[PDB]
Design a protein around this ligand. Structure first.
Ligand SMILES: Cc1nc(N2CCC(N(C)c3cc(C(=O)NCCN4CCCC4)cnn3)CC2)nc(C)c1CC(C)C
Ligand SMILES: Cc1nc(N2CCC(N(C)c3cc(C(=O)NCCN4CCCC4)cnn3)CC2)nc(C)c1CC(C)C
Lengths: 188, 218, 213, 188, 213, 218
């Protein structure tokens, strides 16, 4: 009856809270929660469409509802296929992120920090603010300019791009800035 | 508002050495964990030239021998190696709180081997004497250090009246201080004597240098 | 790069007003804010205020509020600063910077009720004591003028290696400065030497040549 | 009855479409549409909460629903107050963007392109890719490295920060990169 | 900065595998991919393949697939390349770069079944009719050795300027190179001269000094 | 596959001039509208040094006198001003498609004023003759240009058996070509004659420069 409306209101409140906090803060766990919510978004839409269709007032409404449900389902299946292809290529669990199918590997201090990249571009910039590193708008922890990675890479289905550190500048002692430019590509 | 107490009021360092300029803020100019403190230099007759901003950021085109440091209230500008063309006045400014205030400025003097003043005395122009006036000038060019005193003797009597001295700023071509002395008089006193001399006492020789002309051969 | 050309020196009587322009070139005028700075006594740099030439909202020093007003003319890319009710304290050099990097040449403002006077230039030829050395030292005595500044050059800009211009010294309400040039003994009186002085406040350009006694 | 569910499904579909296209593409009109949708999000939540409260099954559900509605309402009112303060300061219509209360003025080729900034930071980076400029992740049209603005500014309620161009590098001919570092602050 | 130190030269019989190490320093070994390059005949640079030392997945040239296998040892930061079924075609210098910027010094691989022979160094003292030069020039004849390379230095590294080392010439399965040093005529036999050769393959370091005839 | 074809196979330019190196691809190496084309420099006995990447990006620390240009299939490397230490081999590599291929390499030669070879003939060591062999070596140091022919003759009869020559690469300290000649023989032929002559014909003098020695004084 009204339970659907209440849960929808709670969902919108949660989305607002994540939006107003995850935008300013890029904590890894908050980021993962936002990813999980974004993934959940699709089944919510499918459930809404099917529930509207089953209680269709007239034939046209049910038909359009089921058509939209099928559209969302095929979109979800295609995105799952691409995600599984990316996982097979990179064998990393980050490939199943609902954001996209491009991964950014950052060899930071012994480990490699893989993050979803929204677009593979010729230039990716790095900015260090108060000692905290952000590459492609992703908080990768504490780092300083002198030990910044000299090479990163971006992994996509049937492609692998390698970047190298361009010019690196130091701003106000602890803050800083840098860029990563493509110099190589590897298919398969 | 804020007063940037810049120290020392004057500095003197030889070539190839390190020069340090201090600038203490009355209160912390820190904002969001960063201090906005520019550093300028101003050679004579020129607008200020920005060297540093945000207390450590070298301006584009400035030699890398200028370094900005410090934080909190105490800030510091370091010049290393002090070169030939660094004789200027250096200012500290805070671009943090309205009004943006400057420091009192400290002038950087370059130390150099002491030289002798090429003392040259000139007779008053007959062109000037056509107007009833006569000023004896005496150029003490290319000496070092700055301190130098001049004695004006007429007929052996020293004169302390009408002696105007005009130093120059330390040259950038060769880092020497030049001086000019002028002893103005109207024609009656000028022709009341014939012998004039410009004696310069400088701490590069035991006895003062003396240059003179007498009105007999004029 | 960017350029900032100001209005030349201006002598203004006490209790008056004047406008210091700062014409911009090499960049879109509305892009960057225009700061105004004042250097009094030659060392005391003081911030006046800044103007955003796009919308036109300013921000003055509370010490200079009511004394300076900042305006812009987007059509001719020239900013302005009007000094109100000038006083003996307002004699200084007023700079216009943009990003703290590109400055103007400085508008020297002299706030005095005294009269203008062109410089009565005189020559300085050596006597019989400086005629024995390898190279002759000649000079030009720019005497009795008002106000600052005066530009002394030798032979209309040819001689610049070994030229000393001694700052002026105010006395009896009239300034006075000397200039010296060191040239080899084979260049004088063999080659012409002229000390061309250009007093801007009086529209005077005296070109006097040194004649040996 | 089921109309609410169908409109909710359509809203989720529209949000997905904007998310998957506005992320890769930053067209000005698409950006404005996304801003309008994000603004609409709040009244949708308020309507859902009030509709749940009016048809409350039990007292506790209605009480919590009205409490959440009041919370959302006071949040909306406070954000409106901040937005109006920013507009009064800057007198620009961009100050009413639902994203935040920080504006980025970019003096680009005679005009000034004001965009909502999510955070005022000591360093803002600029990247030019194939001749298209992005500052703080905002497409500002075609530009090249040599004529890049030498000064930008960030406007906030009771503060105004001025940046200046740091080091600027050119990548692969047409692409490029640059940074903007704080050098001044102006209160009031 | 980064460093890449390889294994020295290796003489390998035909059809016998070998392993070329490339020890990394100055950076975390895992994080930069390691490329392998081959320069044959001294000018033909050929790409072999690259390995990601984190997960261990490689990518070879199809020409070198089955001929070269790339492995890593994260414990010692040492990358490896194993050449399978070597042939006379595989004699070359194998480099290891990381970001195309930092390279190794090159592992010279000689695929031959021939013997090894230390160099029978000889002195080259100018004759009594070879004083026309104002400064005496001496030399060392490194004769009849195998395989490449040979490190010819004069006076154990004292003389690093004015020295010519002439590349070897393979003849009769034995290499041969000469070296020349030009020193002032007042320096020899006034100061001792020694050509210290160092043939690595046979662990031979002959330090021969030139005596006037 | 791709085949980078460099041009010219060898180059020769004097100091202060501009050197242009071409590199044509069999097929376009564009990806997403960009060409990934590195340029390397390899001085003899040294690993390649990366100058340019992404066909226009100067490597960090490389003098800003190497410029990468071109697009599509035709690429180009320009060196200006060509300096004393640019004598090397320059390679073009495409980091676009597996396999990454290199160009054949072009050798950059530096033009310099022609000089004379300090010809010097050395007698075979008695140490070598202890083993039955004797090789006469003749060093032709610090000449230019590269082309030079050495004429060995004993007792007036020219010898062309066992004459092994070993040129050096163009020096970077002096930009000159040195050469070595070796006339190997066993003891019987060496003692069958006494006078040995090493003369070099070079286009810096009218006649060959002759150096010789015999066994009657050594
Ligand atoms: C773990 C798992 N997960 C998923 N899904 C996770 C979320 C989605 N997912 C990862 C996306 C989203 C986009 C996209 O939204 N792109 C929009 C465009 N981006 C924005 C601008 C440019 C780029 C693309 N690809 N994959 C769908 C797949 N399914 C299944 C069955 C399973 C179970 C397994 C173990 C069998
Ligand atoms: C035109 C108008 N508009 C609005 N609203 C527009 C949308 C909201 N709006 C602009 C925000 C959002 C945030 C935020 O969501 N911040 C979250 C934190 N950001 C993310 C990470 C850090 C920064 C903040 N401030 N204002 C609310 C106000 N109301 C009214 C009555 C009117 C009518 C007028 C003409 C009287």
């Amino acid at each position: 009856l009204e339970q659907w409306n209440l849960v929808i209101g709670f969902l919108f409140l949660t989305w607002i809270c994540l939006l107003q906090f995850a935008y300013a803060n890029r904590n890894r766990f908050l980021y993962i929660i936002k990813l999980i919510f974004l993934w959940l978004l699709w089944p919510v839409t499918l459930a809404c469409f099917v529930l509207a269709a089953v209680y269709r007032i007239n034939w046209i409404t049910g038909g359009i509802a089921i058509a939209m449900a099928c559209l969302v389902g095929l979109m979800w299946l295609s995105y799952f296929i691409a995600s599984f292809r990316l996982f097979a290529r990179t064998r990393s669990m980050w490939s199943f992120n609902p954001e996209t199918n491009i991964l950014l590997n950052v060899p930071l201090h012994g480990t490699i920090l893989t993050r979803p990249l929204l677009e593979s571009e010729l230039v990716i910039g790095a900015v260090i603010l108060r000692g905290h590193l952000r590459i492609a708008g992703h908080h990768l922890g504490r780092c300083d300019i002198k030990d910044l990675p000299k090479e990163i890479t971006v992994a996509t289905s049937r492609t692998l791009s390698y970047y190298k550190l361009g010019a690196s500048q130091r701003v106000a002692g602890d803050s800083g800035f840098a860029a990563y430019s493509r110099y190589r590509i590897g298919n398969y | 508002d804020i007063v940037m107490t810049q120290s020392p009021a004057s500095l003197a360092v030889s070539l190839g050495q390190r020069a340090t300029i201090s600038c203490k803020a009355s209160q912390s100019i820190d904002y969001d964990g960063d201090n906005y403190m520019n550093w300028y230099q101003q050679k004579p007759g020129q607008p200020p030239k920005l060297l540093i901003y945000t207390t450590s950021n070298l301006e584009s085109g400035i030699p890398a021998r200028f370094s900005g440091s410090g934080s909190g209230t105490d800030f510091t500008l370091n010049i290393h190696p002090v070169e030939e063309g660094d004789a200027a006045t250096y200012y500290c400014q805070q671009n943090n709180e309205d009004p943006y205030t400057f420091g009192g400025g400290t002038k950087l003097e370059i130390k150099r081997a002491d030289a002798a003043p090429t003392v040259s005395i000139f007779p008053p122009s007959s062109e000037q004497l056509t107007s009833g006036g006569a000023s004896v000038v005496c150029f003490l060019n290319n000496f070092y250090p700055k301190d130098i005193n001049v004695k004006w003797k007429i007929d052996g009597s020293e004169r302390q009246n009408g002696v105007l001295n005009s130093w120059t700023d330390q040259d950038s071509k060769d880092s020497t201080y030049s001086m000019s002395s002028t002893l103005t008089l109207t024609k009656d006193e000028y022709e009341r004597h014939n012998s004039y001399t410009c004696e310069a006492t400088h701490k590069t020789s035991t006895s003062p240098i003396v240059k003179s002309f007498n009105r007999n051969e004029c | 790069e960017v350029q900032l050309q100001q209005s030349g020196p201006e002598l203004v009587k006490p209790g008056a007003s004047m406008k210091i322009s700062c014409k911009t070139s090499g960049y879109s005028f509305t892009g960057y804010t225009m700061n105004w700075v004042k250097q009094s006594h030659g060392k005391n740099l003081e911030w006046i205020g800044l103007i955003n030439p796009y919308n036109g909202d300013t921000s003055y020093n509370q010490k200079f509020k009511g004394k300076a007003t900042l305006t812009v003319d987007k059509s001719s890319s020239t900013a302005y600063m009007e000094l109100l009710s000038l006083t003996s304290e307002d004699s200084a050099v007023y700079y216009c910077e943009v990003i703290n990097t590109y400055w103007g040449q400085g508008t020297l403002v002299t706030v005095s009720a005294a009269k203008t006077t062109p410089p009565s230039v005189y020559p300085l030829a050596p006597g019989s004591a400086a005629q024995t050395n390898s190279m002759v030292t000649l000079g030009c005595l720019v005497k009795g003028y008002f106000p600052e500044p005066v530009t002394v050059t030798w032979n209309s800009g040819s001689l610049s290696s070994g030229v000393h211009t001694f700052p002026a010294v105010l006395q009896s309400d009239l300034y006075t400065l000397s200039s010296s040039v060191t040239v080899p003994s084979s260049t004088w009186p063999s080659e012409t030497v002229t000390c061309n002085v250009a007093h801007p406040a009086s529209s005077t350009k005296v070109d006097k040549k040194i004649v040996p006694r």
